[PDB]
Design a binder for this molecule. Structure first.
Ligand SMILES: [Fe+3]
Ligand SMILES: [Fe+3]
Ligand SMILES: [Fe+3]
Ligand SMILES: [Fe+3]
Ligand SMILES: [Fe+3]
Ligand SMILES: [Fe+3]
Ligand code: NI
Ligand code: NI
Ligand code: NI
Ligand code: NI
Ligand code: NI
Lengths: 167, 167, 167, 167, 167, 167
């Protein structure tokens, strides 16, 4: 097949492609939140900046996978990008909680993919998953947990303040 | 309705969401091309750079329409980003010609959107389109226009030289 | 008539004079709000500074219409500038809702002046309105919208904190 | 009344409000003059700049009195600003001659305001009038008088050259 | 036709070619004027510089339309440029008065070109005319009108001094 | 006649006017070639830039003859400037061969104008031609000669590579 392919189980190839789809999806969800917090009846510019940056991050995570698909000799197969789970994410706190669930869903995929790599004996791919994904994931789950706990005090005045620290 | 809405027809609100979806789809297609030209058996960096920047432009375009939705009081309704036409894009000349076609398609939409805004008497929305999309569209079409003319000379040696000046 | 006059219908020359008055009127309201929020039983330097900038901007928007009148061969007719009806504006939130209302009035007049310009096939005047008035108006309307949503969060303690991040 | 008021007779307070209104009227006259001298059938940029500056001067003198009213514990009451006498100011020499009489008019009211101030033994407010208003007024009257004798000389050629160093 | 053409009615295309030819004719007239004012029996370097600049201005306006014709997919067809009316332009005031009528002439054709553009629903080409041609034209007509009234005053001494600050 | 005129035969004054036309004609050909090589079905920015510089240079060579006419006491007579016969110039190689032919025409006229100058014992005019025209002409002719020999090497692929080293 490919002149570069060496020790790349087609099960791993297919899991990178499905994982490329998910980072684009999470990129799309954070892009909804980012601009939801810029509506004139929401106006939380800190939550908007926080989710814009995550939307760009997740789109970079998908591109690192695409670069990797080629490095190892696989063929990128892009599926559809599902519409985000909501249109209106509610308060900042509700927004963060969907992100916390969404971050952990990506973690359970990334940990399943690492299990696929470890089983087909791919150390290059376990190296990629640990150094460029599993670390960032556990870090961004922790950052949000801190945020969620800080934002739980009901109050709208308390949220406008915590917003000022995200800017 | 929202506090800020004035002279903003609901037909226009709905076209701007249609347009956000086309812009994001166009960004998806140029991301497909971009990394298709980074495959080991394609190996054209100059082309891959061009479609990477095109895919950022289109993503930048769709965000300016989302800022616009919120600017006017409209409400972003995000839909599914369909998967690209193809997964393999051919020679650079075939991808260029595919880019020219998608650029002229998006231009039809932007000109259709303009007539919808003239019809409803939204001069703020026609000024958005004239100053930020129709100029970028016509310019981009002519740039792709020239590139197809320089790249039609057969040879793959001509493609590799031309590639080295996109780079 | 005028050596420079060309394609300038008299119903546009008169809408520009009425508009120069209206801009001078809005300038006068923001001036009254500006020093109202500097009284010692009010003491809101962020609101005061905001409405001070807005008086200045609404004055310069009047002087741009006067430069334009002279530029086309028109003849400026200045009339009396009304005092605001109610100079006791209340809280910063009640003053902003009056700002939003007034900012939407001026937009309405500026849009009519444009429909007057388009019906007389004056592409110079429709361009003056699109660039220098309709854009600032929708922006100002959206920025005030955000402020009101933020400010209604009730408490004077919220207004004080909101005021400090307006300075 | 107020918690800052001390030795601020209400006849003083009333005749600051009156003076605010006069200063804004003068700002209006000079602004009328300023843009008159930019008519294409007048075309003296020196006088235009001169009166455009006096318009700013006088609007600032109004705000200094508005600041003073709050600083003392009186309440600002703004009034309708009258439209200027003319909206066609004639030659440059006539316009100066009008301005001289308006600056002599504003001087008379500032001396009356001072008389009211002393009779009521308000040394704070006579210092304000002497340092901020009465002294601008005499050099302003002397500057305008110097210009009038410089310009007396008939000729449009001599007004064109005077206008060159006013610029 | 072309591979870039989209929404470019051929009546627009024809009346850009016509306009190219008009702009080059104006470049020629002002160039005639420019070097006339350097005859040793005329000797006004201010007017020479002024029209020598307008000659450059207008030649650039031609090339912007030639660029526009290629950008849109029409074909440039150049025509013989007519010789100027005079080759002896008289006094400075007469030359301005000729220029005013030529700039008013070029304005009439640009508005017609705009009318053709809108009737055909080409928003790309009306934006071009408004941002690049119609607005240069009004200040140009206003600049030339200001000069004419400044120069009306008989005297060769007064033309010699006007000429000094045109330089 | 003229206060400055001295040793300027009328048959030289007329050859200079005919030459000012011819230079304006050559300027017009290079302008047409310049934007011809910018059409999207041609796409040669090196040739376009070359012939753009050559239009500009042939225009300034016209303005130097006009300065000279005035310098000697002559009287500029401007006539119509012909359009090129064929604006579809073909390949860059066919356009250059037409450039060489035209550049040799102007040399021929410039040499005749010199023989006219020498026969009338006008050492000023023969010096103007030797320094400012005959030198640039032989240089331009030789530079184009080199280009043609290089360009005829047939292939469009050679022309594209040649064009890039002309930019
Ligand atoms: Fe991720
Ligand atoms: Fe786009
Ligand atoms: Fe305004
Ligand atoms: Fe004053
Ligand atoms: Fe022009
Ligand atoms: Fe030449
Ligand atoms: Ni608090
Ligand atoms: Ni509480
Ligand atoms: Ni005299
Ligand atoms: Ni004199
Ligand atoms: Ni070969």
């Amino acid at each position: 097949a490919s002149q570069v392919r060496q020790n790349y189980h087609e099960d791993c190839e297919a899991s990178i492609n499905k994982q490329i789809n998910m980072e684009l999806y999470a990129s799309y969800v954070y892009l909804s939140m980012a601009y939801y917090f810029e509506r004139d009846d929401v106006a939380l510019p800190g939550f908007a900046k926080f989710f814009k940056e995550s939307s760009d991050e997740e789109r970079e995570h998908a591109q690192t996978f695409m670069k990797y698909q080629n490095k190892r000799g696989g063929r990128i197969v892009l599926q559809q990008i599902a519409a985000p789970s909501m249109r209106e994410w509610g308060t900042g706190l509700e927004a963060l909680q969907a992100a916390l669930d969404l971050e952990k869903q990506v973690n359970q995929s990334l940990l399943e993919l690492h299990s696929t790599a470890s089983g087909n004996n791919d150390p290059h791919l376990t190296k990629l998953l640990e150094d460029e994904y599993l670390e960032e994931q556990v870090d961004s789950i922790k950052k949000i947990g801190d945020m969620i706990t800080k934002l739980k005090r009901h109050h709208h005045h308390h949220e406008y303040m915590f917003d000022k620290e995200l800017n």
